Amino acid sequence: TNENDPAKHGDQHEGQHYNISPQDLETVFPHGLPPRFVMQVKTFSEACLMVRKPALELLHYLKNTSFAYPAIRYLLYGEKGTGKTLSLCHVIHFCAKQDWLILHIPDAHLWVKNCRDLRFDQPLEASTWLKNFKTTNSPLGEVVEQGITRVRNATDAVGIVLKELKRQSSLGMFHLLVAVDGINALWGRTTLKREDKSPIAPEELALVHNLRKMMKNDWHGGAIVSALSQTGSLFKPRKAYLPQELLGKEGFDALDPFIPILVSNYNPKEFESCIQYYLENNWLQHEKAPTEEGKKELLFLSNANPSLLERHCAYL
């Protein structure tokens, strides 16, 4: 159920749920996931995550790839569920526990969101990333505030500030372990629309182009991963995790070639263990708990899932 060691490292324990920084959450990811995670932590106090199979794969890939390897895209493509952000959250928590430089970022879809009206530039995602960096935890702050405020001729400005952040060569922005939720809607067909015919192509934009260039063998540090999630997909169909068909030909050619194995879902054994723990804690409320009918309904409808388990627990 619960981990027997808050200290993180080469973590294993495939199943039991770990415990993120309780009061020290501000030094991990206080501004990132939607309020869904906040509500989950509030209704469960502890947590309901775990060292998922994708998390284990990411940890194994990061073990034998220290700062020597700059960046190796550990594209984990799987089915619908299987977790596509809790693994990154656990990786960031482990890096923070190990005293490693970490700076959580929200999402890629939240950055490249739709817009009502619109070489150009955009203040949205740039200002969002800068504010996240500032709120996470020399001329660095000066140029940061400059990029945050001034957004006039922002093409060259953001280019220069990105080049500077990558050329700092010191503590901060050395190895950015981004926790993107949907890095697919970028190389294929960008969500940004064009007022005229023919939508914008992946080889035309500027700000997002430089943002991707920042991940093109830059900032030589520890390895990272760009998850092609789908829970927050936009302008794309369900189960979006293919290599080329998802990003076309040249879109995937520009990316790095690396895909391991499909990922699976939760484990029924540890799920039933957590269900029994919750039952002993008295939380299901529903009076139909002390009976095999409740356990059967759980094992059926939930099918080892987080949202469904939360709904079953908060039925009435």
Binding site: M39, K42, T43, S45, Q285, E287, E293, E297, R311, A314, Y315, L316
Partner: protein
């Protein structure tokens, strides 16, 4: 007549079949059976009270959305209870209750009008006739009052789930609009201590 005189509805009862009776079973077998509906799915989650509540809340024939909104409002009420108990403050299980069965019982108790009103004239002037009613009609009127109060749709600012949750929390503590309407109905019935004999049935 859209229903065929041949086909007939089935019997979904099954808990009793786990151990005269054989003849009744053979009769039930020798009956033109039909398929069960989706809206009124008599499954394990088919609570008659909540089922009728969702049916009344049904708009444009979207019982699925009605049941979803009802479950979401119940979850929001339980989340407020947790905030008062677990989520925010410390788990104080000795002075807080998370069982909506108590709320349902309090509603069934103090939200039932036991006196009906039917404008029965005699000659050429309407007269209010306080006529008693059975338990079924009283429960139906209580449910209708609760639902039509929760469905105000006139504040021009409150939302459907927020409206439902707020009205339920207001009516829980022996107050709210439903209990006030019941008190007004009782007072109106008391105001007619003589005009209770103009009933044809």
């Amino acid at each position: 007549s859209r229903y065929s005189p041949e086909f007939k509805d089935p019997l979904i009862d099954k808990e009793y079949y786990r151990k005269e009776e054989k003849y009744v079973r053979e009769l039930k077998k020798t009956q033109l059976i039909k398929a069960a509906p989706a809206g009124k799915t008599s499954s394990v989650f088919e609570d008659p009270v909540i089922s009728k509540f969702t049916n009344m809340m049904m708009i444009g024939g979207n019982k699925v959305l009605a049941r979803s909104l009802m479950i979401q409002t119940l979850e929001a009420v339980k989340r407020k209870q947790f905030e008062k108990y677990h989520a925010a403050s410390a788990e104080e299980q000795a002075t807080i209750e998370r069982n909506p069965y108590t709320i349902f019982h309090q509603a069934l108790k103090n939200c039932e009008p036991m006196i009906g009103l039917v404008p029965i004239l005699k000659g050429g002037r309407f007269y209010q006739v306080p006529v008693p009613l059975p338990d079924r009609r009283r429960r139906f009127l209580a449910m209708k009052w609760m639902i039509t109060e929760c469905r105000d749709k006139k504040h021009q600012r409150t939302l459907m789930p927020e409206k439902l949750s707020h009205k339920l929390l207001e009516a829980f503590h022996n107050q709210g609009p439903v209990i006030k309407r019941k008190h007004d109905l009782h007072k109106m019935a008391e105001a007619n201590r003589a005009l209770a004999h103009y009933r044809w049935w």
